[PDB]
Design a protein around this ligand. Structure first.
Ligand SMILES: NC(=O)c1ccc[n+]([C@@H]2O[C@H](COP(=O)([O-])OP(=O)(O)OC[C@H]3O[C@@H](n4cnc5c(N)ncnc54)[C@H](O)[C@@H]3O)[C@@H](O)[C@H]2O)c1
Ligand SMILES: NC(=O)c1ccc[n+]([C@@H]2O[C@H](COP(=O)([O-])OP(=O)(O)OC[C@H]3O[C@@H](n4cnc5c(N)ncnc54)[C@H](O)[C@@H]3O)[C@@H](O)[C@H]2O)c1
Lengths: 544, 546
């Protein structure tokens, strides 16, 4: 049982290096991770380190790492260490990167068996995962925007259908609930449902569809919010609800479709049976899993034709159905081009922070800070109040709060000031998911249907990592295949520590500017007016 | 026509930024580039900037760029500029990167015509190209090691057959010749042949196969070295040489097979006809080009089966043949696993430097410098002597000289010392090709047949770019598809400026250690014994070790 150290006592030579060690450990905290005993944090086999030997080597390196040194991590394995500068990142990570022609699961697995690979997902291998909260606001905003577009600005009296109650998928129920809606989420592993119930991310659970629908109608009628976890296999249940004529307003999905071998259970198999299918006949498992997802998607399309609003929530499931012959698998859009992109054009993203002290008092303090720095932003305050009331901390106390260009720097510098004066009991790590305004290229998700068709351009993601290393981040990462699977994405991550020092003030101002700035210029280059405007408004250099 | 500024006069706010401006221009110097009117430096369409407008914007940005600022270049286009630190790179570049599933020439061309793409090759888009000399020692060393392996340690008395006399391929003739051998290099464009001849990278030329064979035979007997450029199409010429029973000792190739649309002329078409075929029916063109490259490779396999030593010289030709149906296209090895890999295990690679002064005297001075710093190293002295004797400068006087781990830092700090005292008349840029011991991932070339089977792992190339940025290089780049084409490689470049300042001494010591250091830890991780030895000898940290 691994968990981040608490307090002000260090195990490393400096706070910046201790921050890495604590966040690495926090990623594997039983309250945080989905299956830490196997180093799995979330999203299928998204791991924190290659294996246990690698894990322990990183810990040792981190404790002896000097203030002007940089540790190199290659797919969860510490592979080198060189002298740099106090302003350079303490750690540099490159996880799951494969030459394009070999960027598929088949080759990944071949390298994995040889002990040469690890799947870092986005925040799993870059140590900045904060439990189900990380994606919460992202999922909340997506549904909130969908609400304003089709239901008058609220999901009150509407029923949402989805599946997948894992680390990140588990945030779907609370997201719909916070928007005042009713939701039924299908999950095939009761253990997963319990995790969501225990952590307050889902209200109820049931194994019978009849009971689920009765609760949903009752809540929809009384116009009250309600989350219901339905035990079953979505590929099957969705068709049952479909052929029963149930009225479903919104349909999406978040099973780990990006990984046919691990993330999706084939219809007709119990978990035990599926486990054996997976172990004994892996290739059979995949063929059957793919067939199930094709069927799962046919059901989503049927709902869309029936009138419900349907969208892909970034698990690449549409691609899987497409690959099986479903020519119209992409008849419904991805949540980014449909609901979130405008937020990116303002430099907004899943910006977040964690209190190394371990004391929630620090998070509450940063929460009040937000209101002090942005007194006129009603929505921001509404979000913080919801967060404080409905989110239960996991591992080190943390906060998800989408801030845009400028707002990030301002918050980061303020946080560092409170760490220095002591209002914040210990240093705080500032980070984000790799899904952000200027850190990722992913044709089936974040960069789906860019107005200029630059969907596949991966230069920006690479530039994001390069500039943030130059700007002075604490640890920078470059991953491949996060979210959508092998061959479908390239993205970067950035974490900077606010230890209260003057050095941090310098680095924070720089990197908290470059990171979101990157997002503004990428969208300005694509021709998004709001982004072009933000550039002029906050003096973001756009050469041409 | 464009060329690098010369002298101590500055157009930028500092020498580091000035260095960028001059290497950028030097890349398009008529003396250096293959087709600078279209921003083309070498290797098919490897360019220096997306288009002319992008080029001029870069210049303007470079002239106002401050000592603690960083310009961002995306596929040859300046897209942003942020405040960083004096030790952070002045320019960060990401060229040609495409999400894997879309990393093919079809999607590249689609984006390119929309003005959304540029092929950076390796040193074209990262402004560190120095004419044909850049790859010269690499090619010399390849043939040198091959000689030791199959011909007693010399090519004297052997005949090599190859093709491709472009910017990089043009170094083949001289490379064989420097090994005392005889070579016939087939080139379909006479203007390309004249270019090699004028730059002294090739001895003679002829459009007569008969004449060529007679010159080679005469020389192979007299035991004299001789390079012959043969006007023609390899697809056809090689089969003629094969079917007439010519005795050929070594066969390789260096046409631009990595780019079917631009780099290979289909058999049976004049250059003028191929241009129209290419503009009008690009898809048909590619089909015909691939058809011809298959025939070309079938001839190479025939020579091998006939007893000649054959090898792929990094243009991905084997792949193009394989994709066409030649099931045994990979019957001959790539030069890296066969001849160069041991060098990478020493952290060696196409290390290079250029004199921003524009005065060859600075280079001759660095040539003497090398000997002073490594007075015991006979091999190093011999190479530098050959280069200074056989290499005619192009654009800013520059020197290619392979240095391994440790040696790079020593030479770099020494050079900086000479810039400080004034013996060197101006700052010098220290760089290299993206092909190096720890900067690239390329299953069909640099990482072909890694002993642990880690061929396709691309993490190290990324880490290379990342570490050098942290180390304090002047400009770092990360490209996709260099050398072998779209989808086949990921790699990083690194350039550092020795301007005589103390800031440079510190940055130089840091980055000239990390760059080659990465090469050592990558091969050691793969299990290469010499690499593990060098790590122990130099105390290079390998975290998994207790
Ligand atoms: N859009 C985003 O912002 C975002 C962010 C993070 C992760 N993701 C993606 O979301 C997906 C889920 O991530 P996660 O961390 O929750 O994954 P996870 O691996 O932790 O959980 C996946 C869940 O899918 C369930 N499942 C598999 N087959 C099923 C079936 N047939 N019916 C019902 N449930 C089934 C599993 O039992 C499990 O609980 C992944 O594809 C991931 O990459 C998206
Ligand atoms: N192994 C290495 O260290 C290394 C280094 C740099 C470049 N390269 C590769 O070498 C190749 C050539 O590079 P370059 O800069 O010389 O390219 P280039 O585009 O400048 O020149 C290619 C030459 O091929 C010729 N050609 C095309 N079809 C021909 C035919 N049928 N017969 C004879 N000649 C023909 C062209 O006329 C041209 O002169 C590329 O594939 C490049 O990526 C390898």
């Amino acid at each position: 049982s691994i968990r981040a150290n608490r307090g002000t006592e260090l195990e490393c030579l400096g706070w910046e290096q201790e921050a890495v060690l604590r966040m690495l450990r926090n990623n594997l905290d039983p309250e945080v991770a989905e299956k830490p005993e196997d180093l799995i944090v979330y999203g299928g086999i998204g791991k924190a380190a290659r294996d246990w030997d690698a894990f322990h080597a990183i810990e040792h390196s981190l404790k002896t790492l000097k203030n002007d040194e940089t540790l190199l991590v290659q797919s969860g394995k510490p592979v080198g260490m060189f002298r740099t500068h106090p302003q350079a990142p303490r750690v540099l990570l490159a996880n799951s990167v494969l030459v394009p022609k070999w960027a598929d699961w088949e080759h990944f697995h071949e390298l994995e068996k040889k002990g040469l690979m690890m799947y870092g997902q986005m925040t799993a291998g870059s140590w900045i995962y904060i439990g189900s909260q990380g994606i919460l606001q992202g999922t909340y905003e997506t549904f909130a925007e969908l609400a304003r577009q089709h239901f008058g600005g609220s999901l009150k009296g509407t029923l949402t259908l989805t599946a997948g109650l894992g680390g990140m998928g588990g945030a779907q129920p609370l997201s719909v609930t916070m928007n005042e809606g009713v939701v039924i989420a299908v999950e095939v592993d009761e253990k997963r449902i319990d995790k969501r119930i225990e952590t307050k991310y889902c209200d109820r659970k049931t194994a019978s569809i009849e009971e689920a629908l009765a609760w949903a109608e009752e809540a929809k009628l009384a116009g009250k919010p309600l989350s219901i976890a339905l035990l079953g296999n979505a590929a099957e249940v969705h068709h049952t609800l479909l052929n029963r004529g149930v009225k479903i307003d919104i349909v999406t999905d978040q099973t780990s479709a990006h990984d046919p071998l691990i993330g999706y259970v084939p219809e007709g198999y119990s978990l035990d049976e599926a486990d054996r299918l997976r172990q004994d006949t892996p290739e059979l498992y995949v063929r059957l899993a793919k067939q199930s997802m094709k069927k799962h998607v046919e059901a989503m399309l049927a709902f869309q034709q029936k009138g419900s609003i349907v969208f892909d929530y970034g698990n690449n499931i549409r691609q899987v159905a497409k690959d099986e012959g479903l020519e119209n698998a992409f008849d419904f859009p991805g949540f980014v081009p449909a609901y979130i992109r405008p937020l990116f054009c303002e430099g907004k993203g899943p910006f977040r922070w964690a209190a190394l002290s371990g004391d929630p008092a620090d998070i509450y303090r940063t929460d009040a800070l937000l209101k002090e720095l942005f007194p006129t932003n009603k929505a921001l305050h509404r979000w913080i109040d919801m967060a404080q009331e409905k989110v239960t901390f996991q591992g080190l106390p943390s906060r998800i709060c989408w801030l845009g260009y400028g707002e990030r720097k301002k918050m980061g510098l303020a946080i560092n000031e409170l760490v220095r004066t002591g209002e914040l009991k210990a240093p705080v790590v500032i980070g984000r998911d790799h899904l952000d305004c200027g850190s990722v290229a992913s044709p089936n998700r974040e960069t789906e249907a860019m107005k200029d068709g630059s969907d596949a351009v991966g230069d920006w993601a690479v530039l994001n990592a390069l500039v943030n290393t130059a700007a002075g981040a604490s640890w920078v990462s470059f991953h491949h295949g996060g979210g959508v699977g092998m061959g479908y994405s390239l993205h970067a991550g950035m974490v900077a520590v606010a230890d209260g020092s003057e050095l941090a003030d310098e680095r924070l101002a720089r990197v908290l500017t470059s990171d979101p700035g990157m997002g503004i210029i990428r969208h300005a280059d694509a021709g998004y007016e709001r982004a072009v405007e933000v550039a002029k408004e906050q003096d973001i250099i756009v050469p041409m």
